[PDB]
Amino acid sequence: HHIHTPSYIKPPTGGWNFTPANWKQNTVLVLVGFTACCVGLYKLGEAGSYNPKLKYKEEELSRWNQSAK
Amino acid sequence: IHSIISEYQDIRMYGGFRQFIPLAYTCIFIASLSLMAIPGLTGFYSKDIIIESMYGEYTFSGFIIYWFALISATCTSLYSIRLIYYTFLNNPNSPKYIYINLKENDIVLITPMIILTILSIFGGYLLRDIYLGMGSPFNELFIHPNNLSLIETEFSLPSILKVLPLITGLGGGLILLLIYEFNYSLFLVYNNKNLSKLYSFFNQKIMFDQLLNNLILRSGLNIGWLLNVHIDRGILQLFGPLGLWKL
Amino acid sequence: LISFWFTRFNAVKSGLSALLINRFGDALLVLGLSYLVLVTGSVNYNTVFALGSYLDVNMITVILICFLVASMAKSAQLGLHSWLLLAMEGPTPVSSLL
Amino acid sequence: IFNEIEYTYNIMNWLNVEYLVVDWSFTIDKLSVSMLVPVVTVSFLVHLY
Amino acid sequence: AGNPWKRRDAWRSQGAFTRANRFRGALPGFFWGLGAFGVYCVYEK
Amino acid sequence: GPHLLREDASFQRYGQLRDNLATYWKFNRKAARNVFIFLVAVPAGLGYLAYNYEGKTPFVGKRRTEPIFEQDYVPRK
Amino acid sequence: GVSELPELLSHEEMKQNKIPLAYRDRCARLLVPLNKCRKEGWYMPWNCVQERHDYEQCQYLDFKRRVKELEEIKKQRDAA
Amino acid sequence: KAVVPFSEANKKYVSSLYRKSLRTAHDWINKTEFYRVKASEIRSRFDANKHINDPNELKVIFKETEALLEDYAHPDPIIPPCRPGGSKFERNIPPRVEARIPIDV
Amino acid sequence: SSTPSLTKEIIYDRIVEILESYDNVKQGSTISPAASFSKDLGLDSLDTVEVLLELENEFSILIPDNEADEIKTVQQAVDYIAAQEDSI
Amino acid sequence: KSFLPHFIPKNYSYGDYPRLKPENLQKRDPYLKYDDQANKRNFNEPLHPQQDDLDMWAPDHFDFVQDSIALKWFGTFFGVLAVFSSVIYIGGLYPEKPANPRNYPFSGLAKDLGASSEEDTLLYAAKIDKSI
Amino acid sequence: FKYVRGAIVPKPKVHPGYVITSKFLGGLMWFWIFYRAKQDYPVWFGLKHPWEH
Ligand SMILES: CCCCCCCCCCCCCCCCCC(=O)OC[C@H](COP(=O)(O)OCCN)OC(=O)CCCCCCCCCCCCCCCCC
Ligand SMILES: CCCCCCCCCCCC(=O)OC[C@H](COP(=O)(O)OCC[N+](C)(C)C)OC(=O)CCCCCCCCCCC
Ligand SMILES: CCCCCCCCCCCC(=O)OC[C@H](COP(=O)(O)OCC[N+](C)(C)C)OC(=O)CCCCCCCCCCC
Q: Would the CB atoms of B235 and F35 count as touching at under 8 Å?
């Protein structure tokens, strides 16, 4: 068919149906990275998030409106 | 478009596809009916109430927009019928070698459509009370008390309006279907200069695209040219290098 | 996405038509935010919405007219809609998602 | 939507120019999650398609 | 002359493009959905 | 290096001309029509708006002292 | 079991129920059992049947109340 | 210029006006049965004036035939997708074949 | 299976389908790869362009005025169609 | 028909630069062979002084109808809706309300619409239900 | 393979993998439409009220 000039054109996204010979090996190295980070992102999400409707009770707000008055 | 081997997109080069790709046709059929707000579907339970609330506002603007919206519901029921017939029920326009080589697509391409079809049959009904519920707490959307007309939209509307979109929807659909099927000679519009002018205007999208480019964009680029000619290489060079060299 | 087939001349310019017309609204959206800082000194939801009634009616109009013009670009309403039908140069999945 | 709960992850501060303070804060109210169903659901099927 | 392609456009209206076939079941599963609906009257009543 | 560009004789004239428009420019009645608009007409028009409102816009924390909605209804019928 | 408009709530009651502003009216009292059930019923089209039906009829009477009170003003136009 | 009937170049002009005529009919008429009827007529309108031995008589028709097409031109002609103006024109052009001349920057 | 190419054999068997259904072909002078539209088959200037217009629709391409007038045989149609990227 | 876009000059004299009538390169026949097939230009062809406004990269030019005719059709179409909206407004053909606008208890929910005392009230109040 | 010259297009036989699926999918539509209609043809047209049982 046609020629991809693949000797030199090596963009990060491959180019023209690019697939490396050792693609099965690298994917498991990548599938770990997606799994490593998704698990990592779940930890931070639980630890660093909060509910912004329960930090202050209405009993505390009721003093704020009157104090500003 | 994937199935037809020529990968055409003009529905004037389609025809009689309903049996060679029955699965693709049904997805359009169920979706279009959901788009056209057939009773019991999902688009019905969301689009129809809006058309009522244009009239339920009982102001001048609500009345005028009511007909613009109602025409939109009408045209929706019309260009859908035009789209479905021209591509699935019409006399074939593509060559025969296309029809002998017309197949559906792989199972990976098929799965997403069927799943969206089911939502287009059941999604709207299940979710209706979550959003349109009478008094459901949704303070993220704030409605000032003097702007609530959901009560009068549902209780006070004339009994003929509640069916008006659908009656001109499918009832007007059949009439166009017959013309496209039995009496197509009416639509040979190139002979009629009134219809050709009308067809050209709306096919060219209100001539808005030509107005933008020929007038607005080019004038915007022209002001760049006049600044680039009479100012930057013009008066500033006269009161600059070229002018002072002459003096 | 719209100009994904960058070798195609039509897809290149239709991608530019989408970006420039949208940046028209984006300029108005920025101007709306500045009047939101000018009036309330904030762009938070918890703050600005808590002050809606107390603010001058003219000021809300200046902010929201800018929001409307920006929203006309993205939702492709009349006046800033020429790009919407030029967007079909992208692949069919792009049109479905966008 | 059903349990009347809200989530807010605040990564860090973005702008701190005198009174104008802006965070990299992400919240999920009823409306934010009312829009994440149409977005993520459709986009997942689009990618699968 | 007058339509020299008569024998060419024969198949655009014959075989699977006969008008009976073109509109044959254009409403997908009408009678299956219709047939089921009657049964729910039998099931409920 | 190796002159990796197929230089064009016509593009070079076009590039030569576009970078030397100052030479052929004249201060005819057309240029003054444009020059007046951009250097005087626009600056003065904006210069008036800038100075007219310079200090007349106390929009910081502006308050509302006038109702938005209407109270009583007066039907035509 | 609703046939006529019920008694209005009190100001303090709405605070504890956080009833939305646009629906703080005479029919607000029949809103609270409905809203509570929908939250426990996921706003489904079958888990709040009679509570929802009672409320819609309440808004009907609340709407039909204003119909008589709309015509009453229209007669006062005929005064002069 | 002048029009010389029965010359090869003059015939090709009439051939070109024929592709303009039938394609324009094809653009407006979207049913084959209706199209053949109108396409038959155009040829009859094209073949009735087949015999002309005069320059000036023929040039008026060329003036008229251009006007007939311009007023009847479709505002959205059908184009094959891979032909210029089509939906798939220039898509996925194979890259140019050429040697990379390295430069010592 | 997807669409299996378009080789000259399938091209030839479809052009003949055009001329067989076109009844303006002179009787006798069977459709042959060496035939001539005007000499053998018997078509005039306005007739040949009808065949060209039908041929370009059958193969879903657009033959420009420059090359359509160059095609004078049935083989030249086969060799012209085969040398195109959109002949489907 | 085949008209050139706006603001292209009729004449120009930039000294010794060649004079040539403007040609809208977007409208060249896409089937003819070119040295630069994408730009539809042949090598060493001269350029107009404003050739940047007359090529494939400039904004697309549409010549189906005259730029004046497009205004007539455009303004007429919205002009038609203007009379449809005007006559109803001038005639007052839109229907009257079938019920009184929705009223609200507790002084129109004045306090619940961000009011403090009874002096302002009407500033923040909704439609007052005076008919409890 | 070979192109058969001068033939009609017969009633195509696609795999009932696609045919049955489209029929069930379509049937799932209409059956739902009827099911809602019998229970909401009053309310849809406004001729009755939901609490008029
Ligand atoms: C952007 C912000 C501004 C930045 C720049 C600010 C300063 C710019 C000043 C611009 C003023 C000069 C520009 C216009 C003069 C151009 C000269 C010219 O065009 O030629 C006219 C003539 C030359 O004769 P000719 O060979 O025929 O050329 C004709 C070509 N049209 O020329 C003449 O006939 C002579 C004209 C009268 C000469 C009178 C001499 C009076 C004294 C000279 C002025 C001194 C200024 C400095 C003073 C302190 C110096 C120590
Ligand atoms: C919120 C921030 C998100 C950032 C994440 C970035 C993901 C995308 C990376 C693309 C890399 C790539 O591959 O682009 C390079 C691609 C590769 O082409 P190819 O398909 O590999 O084929 C290869 C053969 N070509 C090249 C002949 C087709 O070609 C290009 O030069 C395309 C033009 C430049 C694209 C610039 C995109 C940059 C992303 C936007 C940055 C804000
Ligand atoms: C208040 C604003 C102050 C801004 C700065 C001052 C103006 C800038 C002038 C640029 C000069 C220039 O361009 O010098 C270079 C220029 C000429 O150009 P060239 O390079 O030889 O090419 C162009 C030559 N041609 C025509 C052959 C192609 O030489 C001269 O004309 C020499 C005389 C210049 C005197 C400068 C006096 C400055 C006085 C300023 C107070 C009025």
A: yes
Question: Phi and psi at residue B190, in whole multiples of 5°?
Answer: -65, -30
Tokens read off for F17: 């001309």
Residue A12, helix vs strand vs coil: coil
Catalytic residue, chosen from I44, I47, I65, I86, is I44
Q: Do B140 and D29 touch (CB under 8 A)?
A: yes
Distances (CA, A) of A19 to A10, A16, A31: 12, 9, 17
CB contacts, 8 Å: J101 with chain G: 66
* CB-ligand 3 contact for B241 (6 Å cutoff): yes
E4 contact partners, CB below 8 Å, separation of at least 6: H40, I22, I23, I24, I50
Q: Which of J36, J41, J60, J111 should be substituted to probe chain C, the one whose Cβ sees the most C Cβ atoms within 10 Å?
A: J60
Q: Which protein residues touch ligand 2 with a CB less than 6 Å away?
A: A 11-15
* Structure-token pair, residue D49: 């398609």
Task: Report the alpha-carbon distance of residue H61 to residue H47 in Å, rounded.
Answer: 13
Contacting residues of H for A3, CB less than 8 Å apart: 95, 97
Number of C-beta neighbours around residue I26 at 10 A:
10
F32-35 long-range contacts (CB < 8 A, ≥24 apart) are F34/B226, F34/B229, F34/B230, F34/B231, F34/B234, F35/B230, F35/B231, F35/B234, F35/B235
In DSSP terms, which residues pair with D8 in a beta bridge? A50, D27
Inter-chain contact A51–D27, Cβ cutoff 8 Å?
no
Q: Could you tell me which residues come within 8 angstroms of residue B161 by beta carbon, excluding any fewer than 6 positions away?
A: B52, B55
DSSP one-letter code for G59? H
Q: Count CA atoms closer than 13 A to H83's CA, side-chain side.
A: 19
This entry's atomic model was obtained through: cryo-EM
Residue F55 burial by Cβ neighbours in a 10 Å radius (0-12, 13-18, 19+):
exposed
Cα B34 from Cα B23, distance rounded (Å):
17
Residue of F nearest to J101 (CA): F73
CA of A18 from ligand 2 middle (Å) equals 15
Cβ-proximal residues to D28 (8 Å cutoff; 6+ apart), any chain: D6, D7, D8, D36
Using CA atoms in the order G6, G8, G12, G14, what is the torsion angle rounded to 10 degrees? 70
Spatial strand order of the sheet with A49-50 comes to A49-50, D7-17, D20-28
B237: CA distance to ligand 3 center in Å? 9
- Atom 31 of ligand 3, nearest CA residue: B245
Other C-beta atoms lying within 10 Å of the C-beta of residue C40: 21
From the list H99, J34, F7, J92, the residue with the least C-alpha distance to A5 is H99
Torsion angle defined by CA atoms of residues B58, B60, B66 and B71, in that order, rounded to the nearest 10 degrees: 160
Q: Are the CB atoms for J117 and B93 separated by under 8 Å?
A: no
Q: How far is D38 from chain A (nearest CA, A)?
A: 22
User: Touching check for H91 and chain C: CB below 8 Å?
Assistant: yes
- B99 touches E12 (CB < 8 A): no
Resolution (A): 3.3
Residue K34 CA to its chain's centroid (Å)? 12
Instruction: For residue H45, list chain E residues with Cβ-Cβ distance below 8 A.
Output: none
Token pair 């007739």: residue? I47
What's the full length of chain A, in residues?
69
- What is the three-class DSSP state of G4? coil
d(CA G53, CA B129): 13
Give the residue on D whose Cα is nearest the Cα of G43: D2
* Cα–Cα distance for residue pair F70/A69, rounded to 1 Å: 30
Strands A49-50 and D20-28: unpaired
The conformational region for residue K14 under phi > 0 = left, psi -120 to 50 = alpha, else beta, is: beta
Length of chain H (residues): 105
**CB-CB under 8 Å, E27 with K25:** no
Q: Is I65 a catalytic residue?
A: no
Q: Which two three-digit tokens encode residue G57?
A: 């009829």
